[PDB]
């Protein structure tokens, strides 16, 4: 299948350099242009530039000219986006996309690379029980959860009972606090009957910090 493969998520502090990559797969890399598109959190698509791998003819958007360097290594079917000095406001998803010339549209998109730029350093979460009680019980179903506090960077994933509990689960998006650290909650609705008999463990995975936490959540 024709595919644009992008390098993984980056976490960087302001001032650091970064080069990310986009490898064409399943087609002749020189037969198309390759463009870069930025999408900042919650905002729209912005075209950054485009490059022909055949001769490295590069064209930049007026907004990004002199702010980034696009290059390509056609021997290994790879185009690059680099920064010499990252800003916090470079936090974004960056898409590689394959262009068709003259028409100038993008027919094939990479999955994107997330770049997080912050003065924060990687930190794994504290996990606290959101314990069930009469206050979270109504009519035989009860809510319990776990609070995933003060991690960086994003993402954490959360499962329940190592995946065996999937019905009723909702894991919310994260909050970014003024510390620069993220927090989220995962919740599940279970039967009240089970609180004394069924054990409930949330499994909190924070790959960026190489941290996994299991926390059994019990009635108060």
């Amino acid at each position: 299948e024709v595919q644009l493969v992008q390098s993984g998520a980056e976490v960087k502090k302001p001032g650091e350099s970064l080069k990310i990559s986009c490898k064409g797969s399943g087609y002749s890399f020189t037969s198309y242009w390759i463009g870069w598109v930025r999408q900042m959190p919650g905002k729209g698509l912005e075209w950054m530039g485009i490059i022909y791998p055949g001769d490295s003819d590069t064209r930049y958007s007026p907004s990004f000219q002199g702010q980034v360097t696009i290059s390509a290594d056609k021997s290994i079917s790879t185009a690059y986006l680099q920064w010499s000095s990252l800003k916090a406001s470079d936090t974004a998803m960056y898409y590689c996309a394959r262009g068709v010339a003259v028409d100038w549209y993008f027919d094939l998109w990479g999955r994107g690379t997330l770049v997080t730029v912050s003065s924060a350093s990687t930190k794994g979460p504290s996990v606290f029980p959101l314990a069930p009680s009469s206050k979270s019980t109504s009519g035989g179903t009860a809510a319990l959860g776990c609070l995933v506090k003060d991690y960086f960077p994003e993402p954490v994933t959360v499962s329940w009972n190592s995946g065996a509990l999937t019905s009723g689960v909702h894991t919310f998006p994260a909050v970014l606090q003024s510390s620069g650290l993220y927090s989220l909650s995962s919740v599940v609705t279970v039967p009240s009957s089970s609180l004394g008999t069924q054990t409930y463990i949330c499994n909190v995975n924070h790959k960026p910090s190489n941290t996994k936490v299991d926390k059994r959540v019990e009635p108060k």
């Binding site: 100038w104 549209y105 027919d107 029980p129 009680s133 609070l147 919310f172």
Partner: protein
């Protein structure tokens, strides 16, 4: 440079159209207009190329057209899968911009009955208090439409400092859920008799309360 409606909405089976308005230097210049669809949590994908043509795999219910300085996408027979963001794109001679992207449009499929939120307020765990922190967690679930207001109270008095709240997003059952957090010091937690999370949704209000003495 390319202005779109920030939001379009419709019931399943209905027809909706998304507008893309440019100046004389881009769409008005006869340059082609292309459209991309971005489902939640996915990369964009090409939806319409050459004003009107459709890549293979794109349903017939998706249609494009151009008229003067504007263009428009048409979805006919909206279903639930079409809830996404849509971006138009073209080229502008003056700005030296091979690609100019539209402002974007969220399309929501309004085929769903109103649902009143379920609110759950958790006090700080004694574990976190031992860490010298106190976070109250107010979880709002199973609601539609997706607009909610959340207000926090300490002994009936508004508290706005130290509140963080997530924008509603959909649960697996296509209803909405949102969360709010109140971050206190242990001393603030214990210096009040109660704390409340107050959730307003379509005129109705739900107030959950916790107390340190519990």
């Amino acid at each position: 440079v390319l202005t779109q409606p920030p939001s379009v909405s419709g019931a399943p089976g209905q027809r909706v159209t998304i507008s893309c308005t440019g100046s004389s230097s881009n769409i008005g210049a006869g340059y082609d207009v292309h459209w991309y669809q971005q489902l939640p949590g996915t990369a964009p994908k090409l939806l319409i190329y050459g004003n009107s043509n459709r890549p293979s795999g794109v349903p017939d219910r998706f249609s494009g057209s151009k008229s003067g300085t504007s263009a428009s996408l048409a979805i006919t027979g909206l279903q639930a899968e079409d809830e996404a963001d849509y971006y138009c794109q073209s080229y502008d001679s003056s700005l030296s911009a091979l690609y100019v992207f539209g402002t974007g449009t969220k399309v929501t499929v309004l085929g769903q009955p109103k649902a009143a939120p379920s609110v759950t307020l958790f006090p700080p765990s004694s574990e976190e208090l031992q860490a010298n922190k106190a976070t109250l967690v107010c979880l709002i679930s199973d609601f539609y439409p997706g607009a909610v207001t959340v207000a926090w109270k300490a002994d009936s008095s508004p508290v706005k400092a130290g509140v963080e709240t997530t924008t509603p997003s959909k649960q697996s059952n296509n209803k909405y859920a949102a969360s709010s957090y109140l971050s206190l010091t242990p001393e603030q937690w214990k210096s009040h008799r109660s704390y409340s999370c107050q959730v307003t949704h379509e005129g109705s209000t739900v107030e959950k309360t916790v107390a340190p003495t519990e």
